[PDB]
Enzyme design. Structure first.
Site, PDB file in Angstrom:
ATOM      1  N   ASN A  32      50.138   4.109 -44.663  1.00  0.00           N
ATOM      2  CA  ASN A  32      49.691   5.468 -44.214  1.00  0.00           C
ATOM      3  C   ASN A  32      50.629   6.477 -44.792  1.00  0.00           C
ATOM      4  OD1 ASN A  32      48.134   7.358 -42.893  1.00  0.00           O
ATOM      5  ND2 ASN A  32      49.183   6.908 -40.727  1.00  0.00           N
ATOM      6  N   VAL A  33      50.094   7.380 -45.496  1.00  0.00           N
ATOM      7  CA  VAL A  33      50.852   8.550 -46.277  1.00  0.00           C
ATOM      8  C   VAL A  33      51.666   9.520 -45.315  1.00  0.00           C
ATOM      9  CG1 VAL A  33      49.672   7.654 -48.491  1.00  0.00           C
ATOM     10  CG2 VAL A  33      48.738   9.749 -47.054  1.00  0.00           C
ATOM     11  N   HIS A  63      50.541  -3.765 -39.895  1.00  0.00           N
ATOM     12  CA  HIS A  63      50.484  -2.742 -38.820  1.00  0.00           C
ATOM     13  C   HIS A  63      51.849  -2.952 -37.766  1.00  0.00           C
ATOM     14  CE1 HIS A  63      46.227  -1.393 -39.934  1.00  0.00           C
ATOM     15  NE2 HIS A  63      46.244  -2.853 -40.250  1.00  0.00           N
ATOM     16  N   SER A  64      52.672  -3.268 -38.296  1.00  0.00           N
ATOM     17  CA  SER A  64      54.032  -3.121 -37.562  1.00  0.00           C
ATOM     18  C   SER A  64      54.162  -1.884 -37.271  1.00  0.00           C
ATOM     19  CB  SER A  64      55.229  -3.623 -38.667  1.00  0.00           C
ATOM     20  OG  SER A  64      55.055  -4.853 -39.181  1.00  0.00           O
ATOM     21  N   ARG A  65      54.908  -1.929 -35.869  1.00  0.00           N
ATOM     22  CA  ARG A  65      55.243  -0.651 -35.325  1.00  0.00           C
ATOM     23  C   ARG A  65      56.731   0.139 -35.863  1.00  0.00           C
ATOM     24  NH1 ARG A  65      53.949   0.623 -29.200  1.00  0.00           N
ATOM     25  NH2 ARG A  65      55.286  -1.291 -28.744  1.00  0.00           N
ATOM     26  N   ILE A  66      56.686   0.217 -37.114  1.00  0.00           N
ATOM     27  CA  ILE A  66      57.920   0.829 -37.599  1.00  0.00           C
ATOM     28  C   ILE A  66      57.308   2.019 -38.603  1.00  0.00           C
ATOM     29  CG2 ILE A  66      59.516   0.285 -39.316  1.00  0.00           C
ATOM     30  CD1 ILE A  66      59.159  -2.514 -38.966  1.00  0.00           C
ATOM     31  N   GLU A  67      58.250   3.335 -38.273  1.00  0.00           N
ATOM     32  CA  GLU A  67      57.433   4.584 -38.902  1.00  0.00           C
ATOM     33  C   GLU A  67      58.943   5.409 -39.022  1.00  0.00           C
ATOM     34  OE1 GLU A  67      54.944   6.247 -36.424  1.00  0.00           O
ATOM     35  OE2 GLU A  67      56.092   6.583 -34.845  1.00  0.00           O
ATOM     36  N   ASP A  96      43.806   7.891 -35.561  1.00  0.00           N
ATOM     37  CA  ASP A  96      43.015   6.505 -34.869  1.00  0.00           C
ATOM     38  C   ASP A  96      43.066   5.476 -36.042  1.00  0.00           C
ATOM     39  OD1 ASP A  96      41.035   7.617 -36.500  1.00  0.00           O
ATOM     40  OD2 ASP A  96      39.441   7.473 -34.991  1.00  0.00           O
ATOM     41  N   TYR A 113      53.645   2.682 -39.577  1.00  0.00           N
ATOM     42  CA  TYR A 113      52.818   1.388 -39.360  1.00  0.00           C
ATOM     43  C   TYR A 113      51.928   0.795 -40.550  1.00  0.00           C
ATOM     44  CZ  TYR A 113      53.223   2.562 -34.298  1.00  0.00           C
ATOM     45  OH  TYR A 113      53.553   3.040 -33.082  1.00  0.00           O
ATOM     46  N   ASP A 128      59.817  14.590 -34.103  1.00  0.00           N
ATOM     47  CA  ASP A 128      60.057  14.158 -35.462  1.00  0.00           C
ATOM     48  C   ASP A 128      60.941  15.110 -36.192  1.00  0.00           C
ATOM     49  OD1 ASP A 128      58.039  12.115 -34.681  1.00  0.00           O
ATOM     50  OD2 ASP A 128      56.577  13.590 -35.285  1.00  0.00           O
TER      51      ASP A 128
END
Ligand SMILES: [Ca+2]
Ligand SMILES: [Cl-]
Length: 443
Positions: free
Chosen positions: A141-142, A193-197, A95, A162, A11
């Site tokens: 999620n921060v 809870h999309s798989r985007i980050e 988790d 997510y 990252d």
């Protein structure tokens, strides 16, 4: 002759300061380079031995205790007007979105960074940062900060991974904390809870848009990680993709988790897993490229994509990559097919374009499939034949105007270096309106 020295920073978040490039990633890892080609590994993990934050486990104790972790996730470091370096650090249990984000400040880019405190939490059992009960289906999620100045000099931070999606906060240019009374900030996209980050925002003065880069899918070898982009006239949106889809609409279906099918249609896809390797010849190849940052060089007008990637046949091994970016005629970036090696856009001659190409089509999916090549030929009469058909034209100095199987793409012709075969190659990188990217490598 081009020389690369590899580093591993998951990252990577690019920052240039006074002629040196640094990447700061997860696990308090970092590396630096003067030429974007030879990197020097500076740090690799969180321990009381890491010079970026001495005695880190004490310095950030509240964060490790909240997040119930012994590591940190993807940092961003940004220099503010006071000349100091502000590290937006974050930790997550892993988790669940039990996470804290804070800021630490250093006089010197290489530290030491001094904790100023946590300013966001997620995963609490009760009232969240926005005054409503925490709900991961709609709240972030921060993690995954990017703190940046817009073209007016206003300070922002986009973040999220997510959970409830991607958010942006107005920031205090003096203290580095968010301005009061925003909660989690304004939602740009996401939910359920999309798989985007890993959001990252880069302004382009030439096109006059903000580009919001995102990572779709899972980071792992089987996760389908891919780099996507959308754009807006304003830093806080609304963002849209190349088809005019509003990114705000993007989310998994209510009551589901990791719904890739619902999100696939949205965003421009710049790069996913691929290999130019074939039975007969070696080639470059990536698995799950993503978690990108981006850089705009004001002196040259050049842009670069900075990311980590895994590789075919190397499991979960990862390294930093840099690929130059070019804006097409429609104001959307295309990535050079090969890693940056000092290449620049130049005048291209037609005689240097015609011939046989290996073609990669990144498509529009989230897929663990390593995209493979097919062979086409760009003919003198401006047709394309072989395993696909269509047409090609050059505009101006190096603009690629390519039709393939009835779809129109626009991008650039570019000679660059293939570091695996160690040869120069003519290349094209183009994009259609569906946000589908195509790369050609000659021969
Ligand atoms: Ca990031
Ligand atoms: Cl490579």
């Amino acid at each position: 002759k081009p020389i690369f020295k590899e580093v591993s920073v998951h990252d990577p978040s690019i920052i240039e300061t006074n002629g040196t490039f640094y990447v700061f990633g997860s696990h308090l890892a970092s590396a630096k380079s003067n030429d974007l080609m030879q990197w020097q590994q500076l740090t690799t993990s969180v321990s009381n031995d890491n010079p970026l934050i001495p005695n880190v486990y004490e310095e950030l104790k509240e964060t490790f205790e909240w997040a119930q972790s012994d590591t940190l996730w993807a940092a961003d470091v940004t220099q503010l007007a006071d000349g100091k370096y502000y590290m937006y650090y974050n930790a997550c249990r892993g988790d669940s979105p039990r996470s804290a984000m804070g800021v630490a400040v250093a006089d010197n880019i290489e530290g030491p960074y001094k904790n100023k405190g946590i300013f966001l939490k997620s995963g609490m059992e009760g009232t969240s940062s926005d005054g409503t009960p925490y709900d991961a289906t709609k709240h972030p999620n921060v993690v995954d900060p990017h703190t940046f100045f817009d073209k007016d000099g206003k300070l922002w931070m986009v973040y999220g991974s997510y959970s409830g999606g991607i958010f942006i906060l107005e920031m205090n240019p003096k203290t580095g904390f968010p301005l009061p009374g925003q909660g989690y900030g304004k939602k740009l996209l996401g939910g359920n809870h999309s798989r985007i980050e890993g959001p990252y925002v880069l302004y382009n003065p030439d096109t006059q848009y903000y580009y919001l880069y995102l990572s779709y899918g899972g980071l792992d070898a089987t996760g389908g990680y891919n780099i996507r982009v959308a754009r807006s006239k304003k830093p806080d949106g609304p963002y849209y993709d190349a088809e005019g889809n509003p990114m705000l609409d993007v989310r998994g279906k209510g009551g589901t988790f990791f719904d890739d099918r619902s999100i696939e249609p949205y965003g421009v896809k710049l790069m996913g897993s691929y290999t130019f390797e074939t039975e007969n010849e070696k080639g470059t190849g990536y698995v799950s490229p993503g978690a990108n940052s981006a850089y705009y060089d004001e002196k040259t007008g050049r842009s670069y994509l900075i990311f980590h990637t895994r590789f075919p046949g190397r499991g979960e091994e990862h390294e930093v990559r840099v690929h130059q970016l070019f804006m097409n005629k429609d104001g959307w970036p295309v990535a050079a097919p090969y890693r940056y090696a000092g290449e620049t856009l130049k005048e291209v001659k037609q005689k240097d374009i015609t011939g046989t190409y290996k073609l990669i089509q990144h498509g529009k999916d989230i897929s663990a499939d390593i995209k493979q090549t097919i062979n086409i030929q760009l003919n003198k009469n401006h047709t394309i034949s072989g395993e696909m058909t269509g047409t090609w034209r050059k505009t101006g100095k190096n603009t690629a105007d390519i039709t393939l199987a009835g779809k129109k793409y626009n991008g650039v012709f570019l000679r660059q270096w293939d570091s695996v075969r160690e040869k120069n190659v003519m290349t094209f990188s183009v994009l259609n309106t569906s946000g589908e990217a195509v790369w050609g490598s000659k021969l």
